[PDB]
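Q: Structure for this?
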Amino acid sequence: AATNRPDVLDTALLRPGRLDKIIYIPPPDHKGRLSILKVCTKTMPIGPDVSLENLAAETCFFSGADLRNLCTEAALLALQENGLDATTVKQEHFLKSLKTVKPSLSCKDLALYENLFKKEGF
Amino acid sequence: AATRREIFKLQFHSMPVSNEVDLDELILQTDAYSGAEIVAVCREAALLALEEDIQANLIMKRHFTQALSTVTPRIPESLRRFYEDYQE
C-alpha cells in the first residue's frame, strides 16, 4: 500500500499483525539528484559545455517529475532557437528553463513527514 | 512595446490621423494596457474630435491627452507585481 497523506490513515490498520515494515521514500538530495539527471540525459545529445553538477546545486525542492520536465523543456527550446535540424543542447538552455519550471515542494509539506516520522503517527 | 506598436498601426490605418501626433510618446504612456483598451483609446479620441466641430477631418494631439485621462488600466499594481515576481 502506498500513500502520500498518512495523517488521515487509521491507527488500527497500522498495528502488529496488520501492516508492518513501514518504509520512507525520501524526497531527493544533491547526490541523489545528480543520478536522476544522468538517467534523463542518457538519450539526449548533450554538448560539452554542460555540467550536470552545477545544475543540481541550483536545484532545490524539486521532485523527481520536475527534473524530467526541466530536461524536456530545455530540449524543446533548443529546437525553437536553433531550427528543426540541430544537434546541440547547451548549458544556457538549462538556465533559461529554470525560469519556467518552478519547484513543487516546500518546508510545510516536508516537515509534516519528519514529524510523523517522529512517532506521533506513521 | 513592439506589440503595442502593431496594435496602434492597425488602428491608424483606417482613422484619419494628422501627422502632428508622436507615436513614441503614446507607446510610453500606455504601459500596463491590455490590447482591447488600446482599441478603446483610439475609438474615444475619434469621438472627442467629432464633438468640437461635427464636420471634422483630422484628429489632433489634445484629444489623445483627454482620452488617456478617461480610460485607465483595469489591472492594479498588486497584480502587476505578482505576475512579474512569479516569473523571477
